[PDB]
Structure 1
Amino acid sequence: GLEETHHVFLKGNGFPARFASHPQQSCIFAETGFGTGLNFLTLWRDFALFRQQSPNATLRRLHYISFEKYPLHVADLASAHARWPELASFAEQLRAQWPLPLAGCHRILLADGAITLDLWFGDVNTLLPTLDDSLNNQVDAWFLDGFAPAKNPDMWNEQLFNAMARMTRPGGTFSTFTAAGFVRRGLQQAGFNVTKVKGFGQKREMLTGTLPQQIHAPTAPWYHRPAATRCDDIAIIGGGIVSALTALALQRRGAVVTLYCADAQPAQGASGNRQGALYPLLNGKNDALETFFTSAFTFARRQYDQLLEQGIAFDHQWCGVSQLAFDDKSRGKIEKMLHTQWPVEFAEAMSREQLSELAGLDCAHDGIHYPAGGWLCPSDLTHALMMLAQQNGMTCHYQHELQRLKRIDSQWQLTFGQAAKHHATVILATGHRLPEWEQTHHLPLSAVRGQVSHIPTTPVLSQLQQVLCYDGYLTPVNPANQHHCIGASYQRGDIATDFRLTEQQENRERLLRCLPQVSWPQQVDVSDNQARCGVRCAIRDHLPMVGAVPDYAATLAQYQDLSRRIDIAVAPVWPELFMVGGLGSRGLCSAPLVAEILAAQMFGEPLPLDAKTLAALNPNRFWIRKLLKG
């Protein structure tokens, strides 16, 4: 059982000995058929011993990538783990984070961020062609497990073996329990030098191999995501939600990061509301957007829960979010969402009466329920994260408004309309003020003002248990303050944040206009004129922008022949300059994954989504779309 898994997969790949001699900060494992996580857990255990033994070794981080067609339920997993008492503490940590069986990639951060696990739910043969370039020449060791080739040969094909080899780092290796000739030959022609060796207790034979030379893969240069060359010296310009997260995700990898915030405090931009909704944006199309939002939402709740379990404090309730079909238009949208077959734990159609049963108040309409969503307080959250970011080594310079940005001799010159500063690597996280630079002003980002009202609760109002979405939204009472949030105005190209009376009334009218069949909405009282204004940064396709800051003039020039050639050059970018923004009204949900993607990209690591989704999040994607045909 345990000793076997060890013999085949860890020993068959050089471990535990390779740990000590590994030349890199992290090591990438890739596994076919996760199952109950035996291989992963056995590997975790060994990497933990190693880290205790040699706290000073090059290898600090571990990245495990795995495919599973039939993801088990967490109970199943707990039942099986009983076979192995000594993996219990690792097993427990993995079960505390098992995700719902939703299709696609689910990144789990384990062992205090020393371990990144990517769970890809789906049939491996179908997923492979869809994957990103950041997987090419990346894998240190394969764990080629699965059903026995004779009992089921459906996965052991040339397409699989080739992709494996394509994703393997030169010098990297694989091992598998099986011995079957066509596998031998299948892996050899894929590009490995294969050795046949005896299995555990000479019961059955098995195979191991090494990739002697890098394979020159199918590649997609136009949407290339390059790494930063130096992560020892980084500045973020921002101070909003996406900065805290971005900072945090870089300090997991040991980057040194510095914060420059225009305001006296963080979260004085758009991340500063009292209560914001958190739920996924579905559309039933299975496009880039849905796929992204499916991972981002679940990831977001995971991270916010981990944070929570570690003492970080912010007002919030995962009370579930109820989205209402109040409209011919909205009802049609909800109807299209509900075409994909979601787990009820993710999203569920429900009737007026069910939603009203849950809500505590008559909801006037049927709709869709998101049981894991809720509200949180973005202000408290951003302050909390900036602080932890600080405590873990991020120097912060508030009242520091960047005024000029210049690259002169390997360094970014920063000027502050106070002491000027220079940095090797810079990230822009400025929200709506993102396209204000020579360097960023060709990006199709827009500013959209919004005002959220603050309203006292009432005995009947206090009853509401869900966040409600219509043409606008109403949160439950915050127990700590006895007030709700109801919003929001949406003013394109308006960037002022002065309180407006017109917009205050509109927030109530939206609620009354959309739920005319019931009477309790009348209890919403905006007459105290308390509200908050802020500016959103919107993108016409609804996905954020995260990556290398692209070079407009250099792109149109470099890619004139593009449409024709479907080996080209990788995309033109401003050196060591990256960004993350364009979160519109869904940043609570999208920030954590965009944050992680940036850190991941800047460390040249493999990324947690497929080629089209990643492509669809790239800063240069809008330019690349015109020139992608003419």
Structure 2
Amino acid sequence: FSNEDGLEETHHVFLKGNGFPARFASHPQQSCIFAETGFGTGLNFLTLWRDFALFRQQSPNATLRRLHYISFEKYPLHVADLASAHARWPELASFAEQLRAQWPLPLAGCHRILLADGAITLDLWFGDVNTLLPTLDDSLNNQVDAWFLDGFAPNPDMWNEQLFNAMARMTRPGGTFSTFTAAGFVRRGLQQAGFNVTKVKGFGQKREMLTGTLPQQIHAPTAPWYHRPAATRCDDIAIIGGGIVSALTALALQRRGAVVTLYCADAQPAQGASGNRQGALYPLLNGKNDALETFFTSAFTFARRQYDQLLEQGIAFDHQWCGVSQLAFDDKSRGKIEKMLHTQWPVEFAEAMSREQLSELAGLDCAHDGIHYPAGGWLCPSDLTHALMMLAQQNGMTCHYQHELQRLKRIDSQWQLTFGSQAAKHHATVILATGHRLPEWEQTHHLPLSAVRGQVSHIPTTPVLSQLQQVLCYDGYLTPVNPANQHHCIGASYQRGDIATDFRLTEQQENRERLLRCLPQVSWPQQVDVSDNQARCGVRCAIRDHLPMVGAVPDYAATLAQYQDLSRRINDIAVAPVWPELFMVGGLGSRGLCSAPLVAEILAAQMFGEPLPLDAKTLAALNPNRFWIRKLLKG
């Protein structure tokens, strides 16, 4: 037993300083929230994990079942650096391996990693703490049970009042912190932030150090107009849906121990918009660093990781992570791509490429230059949705197919559900995930959701078409052959106000026309043949700002009456009015394969009142009431 590896230190300063592991056992909630300034090689996180795992082995019936860890790192290391430093701590080896298996690219923003079969949520915030904290969401307030105040020795950049004030704002009352320093200005900084502070002996030799406790909740400037309320009960949830996002939301809720039931109008899941054979998965970038791009940057990477974790657990679905090549086939598209390339992306996420480079990758002359997304690809969303639905079923979700909801009505603390004609059901909490049909309710009909038919053609491959290795995106898209069926998909029509799903010949020809029109300089696209008239049709739910809608279903009448006064006020203002115990997720447009997993996880986390994985503007930009709140916020 030495001190030289720094493991005993970590345990003394950060775990014991916050009352662990004793505190695991007395902890009164199902989850415990830790936050850390810095992350480094993960020493504090891995040590905590190890202890929390020993505690779960020893007390499988204790209240505490889950750990959430929030970390702020300005200088994210590469996974090889992580591996190299973890050689010092072989006793952490197996936790370390699971961590490194999911370590993300150095992209600015929040990256949520699900570890230990869902018992651990790791929110990695890559960016400067100081510029980050004022951007964070109200869902982080009053949440944190214990802080690991780590980093360089008070170098002074990090240890300002702005950090201490954010920390207290984010601390639950009774929540605590510990740090390795005892610098006077840090002590004074944490007191003025609102903590009680105690000075104690450092580990072994040097230093004194500091611990403390937040005696009272800091009521801090909120944004009540974009409030994200929890469900009061998660032991009785009914999902109305049956597409990709219903299954992901199911699973994200089951990880938290919710009980969920599915009602789906069709005989089978994935008979709506989620039913194609091959769909494209890549991020939507703009180079504007707005809410849209911020969301898609997190969403894409989060979706790839979840899809890989699922595949690792034995879930099966056709797919190739073959890369996506988006072509500058046009003045407009070239301009858009040019703007994206002004932000400096790691080439592991998005890379500018010449016509030659794209074609080299593609196996076919791509006719233009553009941008390449090497982790994008295609998946069979039909297989994926059936697979995730099956998994949710195996894990406890009962499924009632051919249950088209016709009437939804709150009565005496329950939602009464009338179908088309099976028995009426009633539930404490409901979630609407019905895609293009979302705004058909008296409760949802003032939400600006638009419905857009598309038709995707199914085409036989040929020796030349088989050569294609990437998804090609132009004004439309063409996937590589699915080697399991020897067919490709090429789409898609985009018909606003049109919800019929009948095969149309005109639209079948247009899927080929689009390709021929956008790559006129090459001849292989002539090998596309749509004359067997095989296609699939479906209907997207589009939103004019191109971002999903996820959250509580907002109450129009009360919102307008309650915020007529809002602009003058900006005071202590009431939270956004909503229908009680009613939530929604959808508005996925044409990018649901990319956006679905993160919105699902956002919705589950919200309904459980947990900290959310995005900043305030990006969450406000996903909130269902946003188009209204935007007006009222200016008059």
Q: Give TM class, smaller chain.
A: over 0.9
Counterpart CA distance in 2 for 1:184 and 1:375 is 53
- Per the alignment, residue 584 of structure 1 pairs with 589
1:174 positional shift: 0.2
Is 2:383 the partner of 1:380?
A: yes
Counterpart CA distance in 2 for 1:498 and 1:559 is 44
Counterpart CA distance in 2 for 1:70 and 1:203 is 27
Q: For each residue in 1:550-604, what CA deviation from the matched residue of structure 2 results, as whole angstroms up to 9, or x when unmatched? A: 0000100000011112200000000000000000000000000000000000000
- 2:204 pairs with one of 198, 201, 206: 201
Counterpart CA distance in 2 for 1:159 and 1:624 is 29
Q: For each residue in 1:279-321, what CA deviation from the matched residue of structure 2 results, as whole angstroms up to 9, or x when unmatched? A: 0000000000000000000000000000000000000000000
- Per the alignment, residue 312 of structure 2 pairs with 309
Counterpart CA distance in 2 for 1:368 and 1:435 is 36
Is 2:126 the partner of 1:118?
A: no
- Per the alignment, residue 3 of structure 2 pairs with none
- 1:485 pairs with one of 483, 489, 494: 489
Is 2:173 the partner of 1:170?
A: yes
Counterpart CA distance in 2 for 1:573 and 1:107 is 28
Give the secondary structure class of the aligned counterpart of 2:29. coil
- Per the alignment, residue 533 of structure 1 pairs with 537
1:170 positional shift: 0.2
Counterpart CA distance in 2 for 1:267 and 1:60 is 33
Counterpart CA distance in 1 for 2:205 and 2:526 is 78
Give the secondary structure class of the aligned counterpart of 1:344. coil
Give the secondary structure class of the aligned counterpart of 1:108. strand
- 1:472 pairs with one of 476, 480, 484: 476
Q: For each residue in 1:431-453, what CA deviation from the matched residue of structure 2 results, as whole angstroms up to 9, or x when unmatched? A: 00000000000000010000000
1:202 positional shift: 4.0
Counterpart CA distance in 2 for 1:448 and 1:328 is 25
Is 2:631 the partner of 1:619?
A: no
Counterpart CA distance in 1 for 2:379 and 2:489 is 11
Counterpart CA distance in 1 for 2:206 and 2:57 is 34
- Per the alignment, residue 411 of structure 1 pairs with 414
Written as runs of structure 1 = structure 2, the 5 A alignment for 1:137-152 is: 137-149=142-154, 152=155
Counterpart CA distance in 2 for 1:164 and 1:202 is 28
Q: For each residue in 1:58-82, what CA deviation from the matched residue of structure 2 results, as whole angstroms up to 9, or x when unmatched? A: 0001000000000000000000000
1:219 positional shift: 0.5
Q: For each residue in 1:324-372, what CA deviation from the matched residue of structure 2 results, as whole angstroms up to 9, or x when unmatched? A: 0000000000000001000000000000000000000000000000000
Q: For each residue in 1:466-524, what CA deviation from the matched residue of structure 2 results, as whole angstroms up to 9, or x when unmatched? A: 00000000000000000000000000010000000000000000000000000000000
1:133 positional shift: 0.1
1:387 positional shift: 0.2
1:92 positional shift: 0.1
Written as runs of structure 1 = structure 2, the 5 A alignment for 1:344-383 is: 344-383=347-386
Q: For each residue in 1:391-424, what CA deviation from the matched residue of structure 2 results, as whole angstroms up to 9, or x when unmatched? A: 0000000010001001000000000111110000
1:189 positional shift: 0.7
Q: For each residue in 1:113-133, what CA deviation from the matched residue of structure 2 results, as whole angstroms up to 9, or x when unmatched? A: 000000000010110000000
Counterpart CA distance in 2 for 1:196 and 1:218 is 31
Counterpart CA distance in 2 for 1:193 and 1:623 is 42
Q: For each residue in 1:145-180, what CA deviation from the matched residue of structure 2 results, as whole angstroms up to 9, or x when unmatched? A: 01110xx10000011001000100000000000110
1:203 positional shift: 2.1
- Per the alignment, residue 398 of structure 1 pairs with 401
Counterpart CA distance in 2 for 1:396 and 1:244 is 11
Give the secondary structure class of the aligned counterpart of 1:200. coil
Counterpart CA distance in 2 for 1:234 and 1:612 is 28
Give the secondary structure class of the aligned counterpart of 2:274. coil
- The percentage of counterpart residues that share the same residue type is 100
Counterpart CA distance in 1 for 2:633 and 2:563 is 9
Give the secondary structure class of the aligned counterpart of 1:465. coil
Is 2:70 the partner of 1:72?
A: no
Give the secondary structure class of the aligned counterpart of 2:64. coil
Is 2:504 the partner of 1:500?
A: yes
Counterpart CA distance in 1 for 2:165 and 2:353 is 46
Counterpart CA distance in 2 for 1:400 and 1:202 is 69
Counterpart CA distance in 2 for 1:624 and 1:32 is 33
Counterpart CA distance in 2 for 1:136 and 1:416 is 40
1:216 positional shift: 1.0
Give the secondary structure class of the aligned counterpart of 1:596. helix
Is 2:251 the partner of 1:248?
A: yes
Give the secondary structure class of the aligned counterpart of 1:141. strand
Query: What 5-or-longer segments of structure 1 have no aligned partner?
Result: none
1:628 positional shift: 1.0
Q: For each residue in 1:173-203, what CA deviation from the matched residue of structure 2 results, as whole angstroms up to 9, or x when unmatched? A: 0000011010011101110000000011142
Counterpart CA distance in 1 for 2:161 and 2:443 is 45
1:211 positional shift: 0.2
Give the secondary structure class of the aligned counterpart of 2:173. strand
Is 2:294 the partner of 1:294?
A: no
Give the secondary structure class of the aligned counterpart of 2:453. strand
- 1:156 pairs with one of 155, 159, 164: 159
- 1:607 pairs with one of 604, 612, 634: 612
Counterpart CA distance in 1 for 2:66 and 2:49 is 11
- 1:36 pairs with one of 33, 37, 41: 41
- Per the alignment, residue 569 of structure 2 pairs with 565
Counterpart CA distance in 2 for 1:183 and 1:627 is 41
Query: What 5-or-longer segments of structure 2 have no aligned partner?
Result: 1-5
- CA-atom RMSD in angstroms: 0.4
1:204 positional shift: 1.3
1:34 positional shift: 0.5
Counterpart CA distance in 1 for 2:169 and 2:532 is 63
Counterpart CA distance in 1 for 2:356 and 2:471 is 16
Counterpart CA distance in 2 for 1:244 and 1:431 is 13
Give the secondary structure class of the aligned counterpart of 1:284. coil
Counterpart CA distance in 2 for 1:79 and 1:431 is 47
Counterpart CA distance in 2 for 1:405 and 1:191 is 46
Counterpart CA distance in 2 for 1:529 and 1:266 is 24
